[PDB]
């Protein structure tokens, strides 16, 4: 099947690293394929780490259930009420721009949950992972764009990606494996 489209975020990051440099359609496909592959690798390994070592965590769920156990009936009813009012008021009362990211911290989240990588997802995991995808994207586009200017073109083509990633030891190791 098909994976998600990061194309617009690759484009924003591109416009920050090399603003007047364009990108072709195929090259954008390559970049999106990279961002996806790294998302599945980091999300996969992080998922293995999560399922392997599990830590005990108190959440509103266990507090609510404990309250329903300990308190008698009408008490427990109104206490569950006030608790839920308090947490929803705590919630309802920008995420990427908060972290200062072009990448969609909100979308990385709904994906980490969609992918069934874990039963729960923390916060700052989409911030960390979105920041990492944004950084890797930024490096690849900076090198490939420099390759676009030294080959004297106005846009990035898939060849420029091959040049930039092959002639960088670390990026070649990363995107070769």
């Amino acid at each position: 099947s098909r994976k998600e489209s990061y194309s617009i975020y690759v484009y924003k990051v591109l416009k920050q690293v090399h603003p007047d440099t364009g990108i072709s359609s195929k090259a954008m496909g390559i970049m999106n394929s990279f961002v996806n592959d790294i998302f599945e690798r980091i999300a996969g390994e992080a998922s293995r780490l999560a399922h392997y070592n599990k830590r005990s965590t108190i959440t509103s769920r266990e507090i609510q259930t404990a309250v329903r156990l300990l308190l008698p009936g009408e008490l427990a009813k109104h206490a569950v009420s006030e608790g839920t009012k308090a947490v929803t008021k705590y919630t309802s009362a920008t995420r990427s721009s908060r972290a200062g990211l072009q990448f969609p911290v909100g979308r990385v989240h709904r994906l980490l949950r969609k992918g069934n990588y874990s039963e729960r997802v923390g916060a700052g995991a989409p911030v960390y992972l979105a920041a990492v995808l944004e950084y890797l994207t930024a490096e690849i586009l900076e090198l490939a764009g420099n390759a676009a200017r030294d080959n004297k073109k106005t846009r990035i083509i898939p060849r420029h990606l091959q040049l930039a990633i092959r002639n960088d030891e670390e990026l070649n190791k990363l995107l070769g494996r």
Partner: peptide, 8 residues
């Protein structure tokens, strides 16, 4: 190989 541009 057309150039990429944002869309709606």
């Amino acid at each position: 190989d057309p150039s990429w541009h944002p869309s709606d």
